[PDB]
Amino acid sequence: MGRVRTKTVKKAARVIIEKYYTRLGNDFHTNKRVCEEIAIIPSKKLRNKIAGYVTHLMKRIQRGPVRGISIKLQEEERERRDNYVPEVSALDQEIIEVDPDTKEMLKLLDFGSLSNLQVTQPTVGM
């Protein structure tokens, strides 16, 4: 048997999805026609294997993103999550409080407010 697609079958199927993503549905016999229209595959046997990897990749891409294919419609949802996140309109705030040996680090840099104190358990970690 074998059935380990060669790198010339796993590179067509990767370019095709990038260029034509909105045609390539999820069944095999329609993809076998779209692929025959868009590119020039000089054989029937090769055309079918390319169109058969396209379907695998399509089923996988209807989940999370795959690391060889950069499609337009799935960039923008990452671009969003980098532009901002649903969590906060405030900063994670300046109103935060700390403990000793830093009050004296500031006493030589001149701060005077919004802090706390607790002298830690009296020997190094255990």
Partner: protein, 56 residues
């Protein structure tokens, strides 16, 4: 392949050339190499679309 006679025996020559896929031409052959899939891609797809309806 060819022969060459020199005053010390014979030499032989072998030459092989690979023709450069002349599409439809006469400089090389048609029908590119089998493992040569090639993808074509057009442009001008502007999606801006509200449902307008032209009339002829």
């Amino acid at each position: 392949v060819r022969h060459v006679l020199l005053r010390q025996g014979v030499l032989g020559i072998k030459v092989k050339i690979m023709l450069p896929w002349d599409p439809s031409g006469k400089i090389g052959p048609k029908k590119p190499l089998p493992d040569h899939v090639s993808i074509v891609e057009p442009k001008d797809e502007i999606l801006p679309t509200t449902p307008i309806s032209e009339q002829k």
